[PDB]
């Protein structure tokens, strides 16, 4: 950790230039900018007291959660969080091949899914619920090691009146204010479908619009997973694919109690390879 000056961060972000190439992404909770400090390329997240909680929620969890499959926080400071730069961005942007990056091989996809499961496993073992598991919050380092980000809106492992998260990924019970680690499982389910299909979780111009409903159609023998396997790879085999799809289907059980725990997800993803 460390305590950066707002002016230093401002200086290394070209006055937080809200224009891409120093900007690199934007959630609901803030904007992310590229920076250089201590000869280290960094990410700078600039973030009513709700927002100030998400800052300390990020610090509190990042103060007591270091794992190979979680992003690393370097410091803080207009509230600003500083992270180690993830040169290969988000799983979402790499699945979509944004900026012309090569399609991820099935081999790398299988590694990213296990990494992502291990990061969720560490969170759940340390009595944290992420509450916003999605391809955009799985980041990729210099070796394409999966790194879970955005532990804002996380909570100790109940109902809330402020339903938060990303609709296209959220469990039914989470959409009704419930807060259970089994919500993280369902959302990871949607991530596994993104990995298999290369399709976004919501596409306004697509029928169906939600990848969730594609999942349901396949369970009702009206679609097939083979017909949805991402065509932008040459190293997929049916066995590993339909084994990963099996994990996603178990993850996407509408009834929370019938979904596996993150430990069983990890095991099933290992058995796959
Ligand atoms: O670094 C954090 N995030 C982020 C990091 C990010 C890197 N990029 C750029 C990116 O992936 N690029 C990929 C390669 N590119 C090319 O053009 C290319 C290269 C080879 C062949 C063809 C094309 C362009 C650059 N985009 C990013 C967004 C977000 C981060 C964020 C947080 N966070 O709390 O938001 C925490 C920890 C780390």
Author numbering: 165 to 185, 190 to 215, 223 to 252, 257 to 336, 343 to 458
Give sentences from the paper:
Our approach to generating an orally active IRAK4 inhibitor started with high throughput screening (HTS) of 3 million compounds in Bayer’s proprietary compound library. We hypothesized after careful assessment of the residues lining the binding-site of compound 5 that we could simultaneously replace the nitrophenyl group, reduce molecular weight, and expand the observed kinase selectivity to more kinome family members. A docking pose based on the IRAK4 cocrystal structure led to the hypothesis that the positioning of the nitrophenyl group in direct proximity to the Tyr gatekeeper provides an opportunity to modulate aromatic–aromatic interactions by varying the aromatic system. This would allow for exploitation of this binding-site feature, which is unique to IRAKs in the human kinome. The proposed binding mode employs the trans-amide as a hinge binder. As such, it features a single hydrogen bond at the hinge region, a feature not found in many of our various HTS series when docked to the pocket. Generation of a cocrystal structure was first achieved with compound 5. Although the protein crystallized in a different space group, its structure largely resembled that published by Wang et al. with some recognizable differences in the conformation of the nucleotide binding loop (NBL).
Interleukin-1 receptor-associated kinase 4 (IRAK4) is ubiquitously expressed and is a central regulator of the innate immune system. Upon binding of the respective ligand, TLRs (except TLR3) and receptors of the IL-1 (IL-1R) family signal via IRAK4. In this process, ligand–receptor binding is associated with recruitment of myeloid differentiation primary response 88 (MyD88) protein to the receptor, where it interacts with IRAK4 forming the myddosome. In summary, IRAK4 appears to be indispensable in TLR/IL-1R signaling, and activation of the IRAK4 pathway is associated with inflammatory and autoimmune disorders such as atopic dermatitis, lupus erythematosus, hidradenitis suppurativa, and rheumatoid arthritis.
